[PDB]
Amino acid sequence: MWRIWLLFDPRRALVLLFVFLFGLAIIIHFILLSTSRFNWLDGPRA
Amino acid sequence: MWRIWLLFDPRRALVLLFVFLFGLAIIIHFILLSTSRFNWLDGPRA
Amino acid sequence: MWRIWLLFDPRRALVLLFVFLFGLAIIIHFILLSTSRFNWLDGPR
Amino acid sequence: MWRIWLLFDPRRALVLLFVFLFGLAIIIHFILLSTSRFNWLDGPRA
Amino acid sequence: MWRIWLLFDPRRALVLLFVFLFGLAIIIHFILLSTSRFNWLDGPRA
Amino acid sequence: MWRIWLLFDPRRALVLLFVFLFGLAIIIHFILLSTSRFNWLDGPRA
Amino acid sequence: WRIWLLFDPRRALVLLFVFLFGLAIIIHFILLSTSRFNWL
Amino acid sequence: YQNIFTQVQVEGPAYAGVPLRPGSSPRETQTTFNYWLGKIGDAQVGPVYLGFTGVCSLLCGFVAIEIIGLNMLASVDWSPIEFLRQFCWLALEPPKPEYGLTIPPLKEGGWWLMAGFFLTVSIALWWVRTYRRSRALGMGTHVSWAFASAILLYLALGFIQPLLMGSWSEAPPFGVFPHLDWTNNFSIKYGNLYYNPFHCLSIAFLYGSALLFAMHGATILAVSRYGGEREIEQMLDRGTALERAALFWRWTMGFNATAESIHRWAWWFAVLCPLTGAIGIILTGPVVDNWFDWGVKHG
Amino acid sequence: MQPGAYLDLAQVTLYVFWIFFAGLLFYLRREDKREGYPLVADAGSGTRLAKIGVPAPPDPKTYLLRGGATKTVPSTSNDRPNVALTPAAPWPGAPFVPTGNPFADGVGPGSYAQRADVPELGLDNLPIIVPLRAAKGMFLDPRDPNPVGMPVVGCDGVVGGTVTEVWVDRAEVLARYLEVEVAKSRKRVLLPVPFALINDPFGKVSVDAIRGDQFAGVPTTSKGDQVSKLEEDKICAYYGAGTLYATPLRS
Amino acid sequence: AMLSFEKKYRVRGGTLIGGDLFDFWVGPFYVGIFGVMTVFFALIGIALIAWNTALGPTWNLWQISVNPPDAKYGLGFAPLAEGGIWQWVSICATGAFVTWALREVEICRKLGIGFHVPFAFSFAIFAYVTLVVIRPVLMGSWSYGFPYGIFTHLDWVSNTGYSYGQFHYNPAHMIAITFFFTTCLALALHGGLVLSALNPDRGEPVKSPEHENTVFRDLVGYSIGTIGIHRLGLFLALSAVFFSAVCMIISGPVLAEGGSWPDWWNWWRNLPIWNP
Amino acid sequence: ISGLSEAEAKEFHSIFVTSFFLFIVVAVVAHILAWMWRPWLPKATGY
Amino acid sequence: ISGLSEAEAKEFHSIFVTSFFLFIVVAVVAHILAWMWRPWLPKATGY
Amino acid sequence: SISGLSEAEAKEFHSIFVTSFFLFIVVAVVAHILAWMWRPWLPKATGY
Amino acid sequence: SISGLSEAEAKEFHSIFVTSFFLFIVVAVVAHILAWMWRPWLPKATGY
Amino acid sequence: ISGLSEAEAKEFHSIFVTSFFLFIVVAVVAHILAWMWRPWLP
Ligand code: BCL
Ligand code: BCL
Ligand SMILES: CC[C@H]1c2cc3[nH]c4c(c3C)C(=O)[C@H](C(=O)OC)c4c3nc(cc4[nH]c(cc(n2)[C@@H]1C)c(C(C)=O)c4C)[C@@H](C)[C@@H]3CCC(=O)OC/C=C(\C)CCC[C@@H](C)CCC[C@@H](C)CCCC(C)C
Ligand SMILES: CC(C)C/C=C/[C@H](C)C/C=C/[C@@H](C)CCC[C@H](C)CCCC[C@@H](C)CCC[C@H](C)CCC[C@@H](C)CCCC(C)(C)O
Ligand SMILES: CCCCCCCCCCCCO[C@@H]1O[C@H](CO)[C@@H](O[C@H]2O[C@H](CO)[C@@H](O)[C@H](O)[C@H]2O)[C@H](O)[C@H]1O
Ligand SMILES: CCCCCCCCCCCCO[C@@H]1O[C@H](CO)[C@@H](O[C@H]2O[C@H](CO)[C@@H](O)[C@H](O)[C@H]2O)[C@H](O)[C@H]1O
Ligand SMILES: [Fe+3]
């Protein structure tokens, strides 16, 4: 077993993991959507 | 009407009345002094 | 009218009245001194 | 009139009077010195 | 007039008088040094 | 005049007098050094 | 010695030393203020 | 050791609080304990009584915040990306000058006017809530009258000075950097606000409140080993802690306060900061339009 | 005044403020004088007339307490005017020297006020500073160390006693005192928490104000499960005396 | 004279230097060696200010100004009539502030209390030293210190702020302002709370710390307590001053003098998340 | 109450009225002199 | 009896009055000399 | 009973005080005479 | 006494005090003579 | 001022100084490697 759960109660060390994963997925989608090549909505500029 | 002094102690009533009356008198004097017509010191046309 | 001194301590009343009188006299003097007609030091100009 | 000393501590009243007199004297002197006419050190051009 | 020392502590009065006299002398000297006519160090242009 | 030492303790009065005299000397030396005529280090501005 | 009946030297000496040091510093800074005696 | 933190923290039952007068409703029952709060202070996080005035205050305030946010989202074409990018630069701007004190079109200051109305109603309701929460425990209303000073500055900034100037366009926008720019341009447009004397006084009282609260906090922490933090009891029955505090300040600067009058000093400095501020703002434009010219006229 | 005059509304408002603020400073400095007055004139000063200052102290202020009781400030009975001190010099402003033992006299950093010899009752008319054995429902929150059991040691490294109980404040959950079974006389004395380093540096809790034996002299509380305001000042004052008068030969 | 309860505490000992030579009071004031030194420095400084004014055009209190040296002197001693008086007034002022903090330390030792007040004053001393010593040294000339004048140092603040575009966009400056406004808020709250408990509504008894906790809860949401409030107040004021000092250190030594604080924020607008 | 007996009150009040009246007389003489130096209260067209 | 006795009050008041009168007469001489130096109270047109 | 002293002490201090005050005033008068010899003050309304 | 000096000790201290004060004054006088020989002060109304 | 004993202060200070020294030695090796890349003194 991994006792990082013992230092970190999963009741909080899993909701923070999820808010972080959500923030990361949002950031990556935003980056792709800001590029001209990888935009899938109004995709390529110029 | 004398029963009013059963509600407010005459001491506080009197000091607040005096400060209020003096403030009002000062305000009115300065308001007049700011006008042209009712300025009694330097007179009109200013 | 003497009964007013039953309402207010004559010491505090007298000190407050003197402070008020001196402040009012100073204010009136400075107001006159700031006008051009009633400035008695330099004069109308 | 002498009864006023049965009310006010004469030492405190007297040092108050001296402080007030000195303050008034230096204030009037400074006012005169700030005017052009009554300046007695440099003279009338001020 | 010796009765004044039945009112005031002559020791504290002496120290206060010294402080006040020195402050006044310094003030007057600096006033004179600030004028042009009575500046006695550099002279009549100040 | 010797009676002045029945009023003031000589140690503290003497040390305070020395501090006062040193401060006065420092101030007069600065004042002389700030002028042009009495700058004994660089001389006048010329 | 008469001054030593006052001002017991076990404490009236380090004060004199810091005073002398402060006065020396003041005079050196005043010298550096000028151009003739600025030795730098 | 010094009392910046609590070495040993005891924990017990949750306190429901003082019972109220027969004029209120049953309060909440959250009463949770946060460890770090107890590390720096007390640990309980409730129970927050939220009655009628509190609920209507939050409703009006969130109406205002919703209006502001929807306008900032519309001003950016509803793009959440561009909203996150430009957030600190977005604002619901005040009405245009051409409209004076009328109700302008929604996109030209009508939305600003409605958000300002609802924010003012929220703030007045919160003030009423502070008043009632104090007088429902039998306490004085000093906190409410300290809040009224901040409210007076806020009204002078957004309502009174725009009234006396005859135009809603004088008022700040609802945005972070844009309201900073409003502050700057207000100083620039009306001379130089450093020569507004009531601005100088407001700054004096702000610096003095910082100074005073540093002094007072440091003084209470310095005598906390003698029970100095129990200020009410030290005032009702003076102990050696408040004697030592008074003596520290009397030997330092020649005069001291008591356990109660120091808090009068505190209250009055903190209150006079926005009072003089509101006066200086109401004077800026209706009375004085160039403060540097006024200062030259005087000094 | 008029648009061209030298007098205008802004400076009139400023002078109104200056008057109001001088009045307010007078009022505040007057409120400041509700304790510690009249002044005690020192050597070489006439003591016939009182020294008060230019804002004279106001009339005594009367506070209403919960149980219909009443307290009038200034608290002149708390002053302890005459104590065991003698002037180090005949001139004014000279410091005083403790004639006896400053720990027992209560002078200097060891001074206390003659507070009421009754505990603080808080809100439910019960003492707020109580041993944990007397406040059921509270617990030391084992997130932090537990002082009980640790033997308390003096400033010179001599063990003074053993921590027996933690005294806490009710309605402000906080540890105020550690009860200490003194070394070998079967006596319990209080130790203010701010005067102790309850961290277990090595194994114990350490107090650097007094040395190990001095724990015998800490003023003891008359009751066993409650402490009065007077005993509170006496204990904190006994520990504060060590800040200047103990220095337990640790050189 | 003494307060009615003061005689217990006016004991000998607790000084740092000098022994019992200066261990005495003058009226209310404790003297110590540092009290003599503080009055010495303050008086030399005030006399130098008066002399600089005597050399100047006006005695108007608002227009009195002791100006720092010209930039041509860099970080060296300037002649007394061309900026040296400013340097010497600065030395006297820093000496006065330091000996004042030390006299407060001596008083703390004599009373047997903590040293929180001199420690907190050291933060204001540090902010002043940042303004007149650290920042102009980092920027290479004493001409960057502010002039000692009631309304000329306001002009210095104005010019310094406007030299970086708009100083509002200085981030440490925004943090410092937040801390000052929160300090004023907390001072009003604390003063009003204690005054409410001590001076209650008519017919009411003096309230207890429990009522204070209750009303503080209903206002701010939670409770910090009687010691927490004073801790928080000390921390808020000290961090306001510390971040003001940081604010000034980063503008001119770090961000160039003709720089722009509004433009510094474009690093956020130009992130690849949303830039193109 | 001010802690003053009615005998003290009447005494203080008589002295106070005398002083107030002398002050008023002096002020009236001062205002007559001031008016002789510079009259205020102009006409609506100025002095 | 806010500090003094009847006799002390009378003695203090006599000394106060005589020294206030000396102050007044010295100030009157001072103002006569000041007026000889430069009169104030100009005409409505100036000096 | 008085504010501090006895009439003997008061009179002794007053004797010394008046002597010192008189010589201080005499020195001041000599100083002012010399100052006036160096620079008179109080100009005419036109100047010096 | 207030200072705690007997009049014997007060007189003894005062003797040395006036001796030192007068030596200080004499040194100051020769210093001012030298300073005047280097730079006289007190100019004419027109300047030096 | 911050509630903390002299033992904790001294041990934390030892830790702080050794951390500072390790930081500085890594700094100087980074500088010499950068010099291997670019000698910044022409
Ligand atoms: C037109 C201008 C004229 C002039 C016209 C007049 C006229 C008219 C009058 C005077 C009067 C006076 N003039 Mg003149 N005077 C002029 C030039 C001067 C000069 C100068 C350097 O040129 C000086 C020093 C003076 C001085 C004086 C005083 C002797 C006197 C002020 C009364 C007084 O002292 O009340 C103060 C009295 C006290 C008792 C104060 C005592 C203070 C005590 C000791 C405690 C104070 C504590 C203090 C606050 C502590 C701090 C001190 C600070 C460190 C300084 N004049 C010019 C030439 N003068 C007045 C006079 O003669 O009155 C009798 C008067 O009517
Ligand atoms: C270039 C900028 C100008 C300048 C332009 C202005 C302008 C304009 C103003 C100030 C004001 C002030 N200035 Mg300024 N100021 C300048 C330079 C300075 C300097 C300096 C070191 O140079 C300092 C220390 C200050 C400091 C100050 C304060 C003393 C004063 C603010 C009082 C206050 O506490 O407001 C804090 C309190 C409030 C802002 C009101 C309280 C708000 C309400 C009550 C709370 C509502 C919260 C709400 C419910 C939350 C939700 C809302 C939604 C999210 C929207 N200024 C320069 C000269 N300054 C103000 C003032 O009063 O001056 C006269 C003001 O209007
Ligand atoms: C003495 C003057 C100082 C002062 C005093 C003061 N403020 C007060 C009080 C007092 C005495 C209260 O009793 C009252 C209070 O409840 O305090 C806890 C309050 C208060 N002062 C507040 C804010 C505040 N005070 C400020 C300033 C000042 N307040 C002065 C410096 C400022 C500044 C400098 O801008 C702000 C932002 C609130 C916390 C509170 C009043 C709350 C209120 O009216 O709520 C209305 C409800 C809504 C708008 C709904 C939404 C609520 C949330 C948005 C609350 C968020 C609070 C805060 C985090 C906002 C910060 C700014 C935002 C843009 C992020
Ligand atoms: C009939 C009329 C005439 C009556 C009305 C008359 C009234 C009386 C007018 C009074 C108006 C005056 C008083 C107002 C004064 C203005 C204030 C001084 C503002 C200054 C400072 C404001 C900013 C610092 C705060 C802006 C808010 C924030 C930046 C944005 C929040 C919105 C979003 C984030 C919410 C996210 C939400 C989303 C969209 C997701 O859902
Ligand atoms: C809630 C706070 C207290 C309640 C409000 C306080 C103020 C109440 C009285 C307000 C009185 C109206 O005040 C008056 O407003 C009008 C228009 O609004 C201004 O009238 C003028 O303002 C300016 C003047 O250049 C121009 O826009 C225009 O010419 C005209 O509108 C007056 O100059 C002002 O004196
Ligand atoms: C017993 C006491 C003896 C005291 C001895 C006195 C020691 C000397 C005191 C230090 C004085 C140094 O004085 C000053 O120092 C700075 C700091 O580098 C020098 O160096 C400075 O030069 C120029 C300006 O001159 C600046 O722009 C530059 O940034 C800085 O390097 C100054 O040119 C020199 O004038
Ligand atoms: Fe407090």
Residue numbers in the entry:
A (entry chain 1), B (entry chain N), D (entry chain G), E (entry chain E), F (entry chain C): 1 to 46
C (entry chain J): 1 to 45
G (entry chain A): 2 to 41
H (entry chain M): 4 to 302
I (entry chain H): 1 to 251
J (entry chain L): 2 to 277
K (entry chain K), L (entry chain I): 6 to 52
M (entry chain F), N (entry chain D): 5 to 52
Which statements did the authors publish about this structure?
The reaction-center light-harvesting complex 1 (RC-LH1) is the core photosynthetic component in purple phototrophic bacteria. The basic unit of photosynthesis in purple phototrophic bacteria consists of a type 2 RC surrounded by light-harvesting complex 1 (LH1), forming the RC-LH1 core complex. LH1 is formed from curved arrays of αβ heterodimers, each of which binds two bacteriochlorophyll (BChl) a molecules and one or two carotenoids.
The 2.65-Å structure of the complex containing protein-W has a 14-heterodimer LH1 interrupted by protein-W, hereafter RC-LH114-W. Complexes containing protein-W were produced from a strain where protein-W was modified with a 10× His tag at its C terminus, permitting efficient separation of the protein-W containing complexes from the majority lacking protein-W by immobilized metal affinity chromatography (IMAC). The presence of protein-W has a marked effect on the LH1 structure; its three TMHs are connected by short loops, with the N terminus on the lumenal side of the complex and the C terminus on the cytoplasmic side. Protein-W is largely hydrophobic with the transmembrane surface formed by TMH2 and TMH3 interacting with LH1 αβ-14. The largest tilt of 25° to 29° relative to the membrane normal is observed for the first αβ-1 heterodimer, in stark contrast to the 2° to 8° tilt of αβ-1 in RC-LH116. Along with the loss of four BChls and two carotenoids due to the absence of two αβ heterodimers, no carotenoid binds to the distorted αβ-1 subunit, resulting in an LH114-W ring containing 13 carotenoids and 28 BChls. As quinone diffusion through the membrane is expected to be faster than diffusion through narrow protein channels, the open LH114-W ring may permit faster RC turnover than the closed LH116 ring, in which quinone access to the RC may be more diffusion limited. We suggest that the absence of a structurally resolved UQ at the RC QB site of RC-LH114-W is likely a consequence of a more disordered and more active complex and that the QB site in RC-LH114-W has been frozen instantaneously in a conformation that reflects this activity, in a particular phase of UQ turnover where the entrance to the QB site has closed. Further, major conformational changes are apparent, notably the shifting of helix de (a short helix in the loop between TMHs D and E) on which L-Phe217 resides into the QB binding pocket and a rotation of L-Tyr223, breaking the hydrogen bond to the backbone of M-Asp45 and closing the entrance of the QB binding site.
